[PDB]
């Protein structure tokens, strides 16, 4: 061989697919192990749910934030998973920061923390891209939406296809016995589903 | 979940930790709490009786190093070895490590939610980059237990006391 | 899909070690592996419990006078081996130990390090003190298993009447990661290089 | 070919694995001799035993540092192969210095220099990882452990499985006949395994 | 398993010889490859009574001015042929014999010395004094045939008004390694580069 | 062992070395000793009477080169030359070559030990790397025996004089 | 009691727990 440099050479470029020289000629490396918890895809991550902030308001504080109280709207979710907002600390929010654009579906999953003698109906309802935030239980029953009743279905679940809102109205008051207080709570969760897609990094802005 | 059953390569039942509405959460760091390459499992229930109401987040984290605020200085002895006795959560929102609480999900979890149950369990298989771990100073799991929703429910003398009660096996620990 | 890969998502050369010193009218660098000494890959990193890598290492010179085309000598030295006092010390010979000498106008230098470790993989987390028994300055979470090594670098011509600063920039590329048990995103700021502590505080997202 | 330089170069790596170009095209070397005492791994080395100071304390001298007099513990010898220690002047504690961590097991000889009539029993323990030292010979016979009478085996031997210490003290009192001295010794002797195995390169520190 | 394979125990190439000299308003190099110029590959090859191996050599400039980019010869001598009296002579053009000219900028120079003797191996120990008959001058233990001819070096370009010191450093890389007859670890410290004498000195180990 | 049958390409019987409890260790070198590409073997046993109590390594090193504490200056003519007159150690700890007595094992070492057996053999091939040497100046292999622990046992008359005998055959030697 | 040879009775699923007692001290609760 002519023996100076190889073509496609006399630089450093950042994110190379070429192999280096090593250290250590024919050191073993220490063996594999065949351990639990094995991931190789952030997908196989970003599908696992997280909490997040439905309660996000100034007054709240430590876990507060991630429940709201049931004693009309109860909580107003601005559905953008990586601009600010409840979803922005969620696995969702935090591995798709990473990237430039995302495609495919989410879910919420809700659960009602109540005592079991404790019922109620929420309308739950979604605003497709482009639509106007639902004012009142009115626009809300015309709106795609569910009724959760928290009988039979303690934590109601709910897709989103591919953003305004997902919106949560007491469509009834609540109802309960005299041995449970009006101190009742929601908890909001989502995750992406198996559909979904990450383009191309770009690097986090929250450290 | 993470799909072993208990394998390496009789329960203990800690005594029932006083919930309150206002209580921050727990955390029990294995092997410490039985005092060995083991398949742990842990099996955790409310005495809470029907009229109550109030939630519980039930997580095992693999090499949980609690952090804490406002020093650089690392945990000391007392603060990270805790026996059954267990440590309180000083900051359940950052699951002390300054990670979010409502990202704590990724690790595995089990919800106790007294309308639907009451009951809860995990197996904890061995995760330790070495084979067998055989000295007292390290503890590769931590299971945590995080109040969600405060407690609540009853009047008066029920005095909201609603008590945890936790079971530890280490099944498949071999020596 | 792109970085949903695992090994796409780490796979990004980081600029782990920046620093400088003069020649003039000491002066050497012994910096250990380990990837906390910058904020941005301590994150993406901190995302996983464990993993398994090669890392390959670059290392770049830059000057500002005050070209002259030096030898720069990039060594390895393992875990808990003897280091240098000085630019001079017998450890800059050492007969059964990697080094790499090279000069600044050729094309950066590259070295692989196979993975490195009497444990099956790096356990990026771990609350324990020691193998066997614990004295009282055995701090909490510093794992001997995960010391890696370090790189150490000097001049090797550093007789020159010309008077200059050498920066150099150090680039890891871990690479070929197998990866372990995911985590709860870190969504706070870090005040040093060996645990975890803080002092955004009590409220993660905006309102 | 374009005759300049190849790719992977413009450098000096210490340990490369790569070729170079001959002086003396095609001098034909002084051929190969078949003679014994070939060696392939350093392996083969360290299965060798050697003598070990078990009498290393200030007093001892020459030769004397390597056997102990039989007129309650006889020796105690400190077991990690590599720190300072009897083994740290043996195959097994020179060839593991030059190397990161080891692993596999070891095995004692012990040999007695005395006269045919003279006999004793012996109870030799070992203590494994994380032990206290047997403080006197009941702590010994809870400990695990062989009874060493001199009469039918000269020479007992110890596997070691993969520390504290092997611990050796006067269960009996000695006995011997009028014509033979109370100056009864014994020889220490260790080697490692078939099983043994060194990981990874760093130069000794006794020279 | 690594470094337990011999080739890969002694295959980490040694700085075999390390000086300089001035060039200003004598200064050649005639080096006989024997490793016993330095202390930690003397103990390290030590360890075995006869080798078999090429010897792969590289030489590394570097300056200290007070960069010119110079010519440098390395030759190599054979066994007991002529050497040089100075920076010029006729040896430095020799016809039947291997040399390579390079530049102070490119990449350090490589070659091989194929197994050069006249016996199947050297003999690392000998201690015998001649093949014939001895006479008084004829020193114990350097046997002619492990004479291993010598590296010889000059700058050609010299003429320069700049004035400066080129350093050397010479490594080589013994390759393809062939051992036979391993021996007890040398303990003790090296009085000079011919013999094997002393001055630790009577217990080689602590207490 | 090295494994050859004395092999190429009448025994001689050396006068007995008196030992006593503080003599440090003795070495003859081969050739020398018969005064040649030969299968050389060892045959040494101790004329010790059964109270007697010590014993021997008996051990052969390829190419020993004696070394000496205090100079750098090389050994002379006599210091090597031995015959079967033989030499001293004058540091059996350091086996004369700055090498630790504990580790000459590696080379083909056997044991005399009173009480197991007064006798032992050893096998020495040819390993010089040129194929016949030919001339009276060079040893290819050093036959060295020392004390690893103090003879003793007798008493008065018996003077511990405990004789060694040692015997040489050049076993398949050509010219 | 804890490390002794135990039952924990939960009043909930079963209001009246059974022990077999083989062949003594006590039974405690």
């Given at each position: 061989v002519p023996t100076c440099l190889l073509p496609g050479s006399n630089q450093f470029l950042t994110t190379d697919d070429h192999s280096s020289a090593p250290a250590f000629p024919d050191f073993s490396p220490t063996p594999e192990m065949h351990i639990p918890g094995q991931?190789?895809?952030?997908?196989?991550?970003?599908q696992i749910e997280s909490m997040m902030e439905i309660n996000n308001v100034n007054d709240?504080?430590?876990?507060?934030?991630?429940?709201?109280?049931?004693?009309?709207?109860?909580?107003?979710?601005?559905?953008?998973?990586?601009?600010?907002?409840?979803?922005?600390?969620?696995?969702?929010?935090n591995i798709s920061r990473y990237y430039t654009h995302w495609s495919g579906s989410l879910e919420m999953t809700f659960m009602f923390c109540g005592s079991f003698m404790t019922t109620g109906k929420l309308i739950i309802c979604y605003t497709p891209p482009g639509g106007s935030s639902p004012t009142d239980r009115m626009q809300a029953m015309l709106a795609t939406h569910v009724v959760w009743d928290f009988g039979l279905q303690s934590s109601i679940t709910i897709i989103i296809p591919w953003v305004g809102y997902v919106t949560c109205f007491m469509q009834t008051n609540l109802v309960a016995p005299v041995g449970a207080a009006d101190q009742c709570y929601i908890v909001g969760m989502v995750a992406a589903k198996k559909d979904f897609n990450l383009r191309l990094m770009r690097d986090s802005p929250d450290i | 979940a993470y799909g072993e059953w208990p394998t390496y390569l009789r329960f203990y039942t800690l005594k029932s930790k006083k919930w309150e509405s206002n209580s921050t959460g727990w955390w029990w760091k294995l092997p410490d709490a039985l005092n060995y390459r083991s398949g742990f499992l842990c099996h955790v229930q409310c005495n809470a009786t029907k009229f109550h109401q109030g939630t519980l987040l039930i997580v095992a984290?693999?090499?949980?190093?609690?952090?804490?605020?406002?020093?650089?200085?690392?945990?000391?002895?007392?603060?990270?070895?805790?026996?059954?006795?267990?440590?309180?959560?000083?900051?359940?929102?950052?699951?002390?490590?300054?990670?979010?609480?409502?990202?704590?999900?990724?690790?595995?979890?089990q919800w106790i939610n007294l309308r639907t149950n009451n009951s809860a369990t995990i197996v904890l298989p061995w995760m330790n980059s070495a084979p067998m771990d055989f000295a007292l100073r390290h503890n590769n799991w931590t299971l945590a237990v995080i109040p969600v929703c405060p407690l609540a429910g009853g009047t008066g003398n029920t005095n909201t006391y609603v008590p945890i009660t936790i079971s530890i096996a280490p099944m498949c620990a071999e020596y | 899909t792109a970085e949903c890969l695992v090994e796409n998502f780490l796979g990004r050369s980081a600029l782990v070690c920046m620093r400088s010193f003069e020649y003039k009218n000491k002066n050497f660098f012994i910096w250990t592996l380990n990837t906390r000494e910058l904020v941005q890959i301590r994150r993406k990193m901190e995302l996983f419990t464990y993993l398994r890598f090669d890392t390959e290492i670059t290392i770049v010179p830059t000057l500002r006078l005050f070209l002259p085309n030096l030898t720069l000598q990039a060594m390895y030295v393992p875990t808990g081996a003897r280091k240098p006092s000085s630019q001079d010390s017998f450890e800059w010979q050492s007969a059964c130990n990697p080094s790499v000498f090279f000069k600044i106008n050729d094309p950066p230098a590259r070295l692989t390090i196979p993975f490195m470790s009497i444990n099956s993989a790096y356990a990026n987390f771990y609350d324990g003190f020691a193998g066997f028994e614990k004295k009282a300055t055995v701090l909490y979470g510093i794992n001997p298993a995960n010391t890696?090594?370090?790189?150490?670098?000097?001049?090797?011509?550093?007789?020159?009447?010309?008077?200059?600063?050498?920066?150099?920039?150090?680039?890891?590329?871990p690479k070929h990661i197998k990866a372990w048990a995911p985590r709860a995103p870190r969504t706070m700021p870090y005040t040093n290089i060996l645990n975890n502590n803080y002092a955004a505080p009590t409220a993660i997202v905006s309102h």
């Open positions: 991931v190789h895809s952030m997908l196989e991550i970003v709240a504080s430590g876990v507060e934030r991630l429940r709201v109280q049931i004693s009309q709207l109860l909580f107003n979710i601005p559905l953008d998973i990586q601009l600010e907002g409840p979803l922005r600390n969620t696995l969702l929010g | 984290i693999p090499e949980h190093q609690i952090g804490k605020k406002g020093t650089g200085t690392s945990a000391s002895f007392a603060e990270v070895m805790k026996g059954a006795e267990g440590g309180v959560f000083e900051q359940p929102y950052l699951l002390d490590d300054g990670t979010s609480l409502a990202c704590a999900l990724v690790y595995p979890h | 890696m090594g370090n790189l150490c670098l000097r001049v090797v011509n550093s007789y020159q009447p010309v008077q200059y600063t050498l920066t150099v920039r150090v680039y890891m590329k």
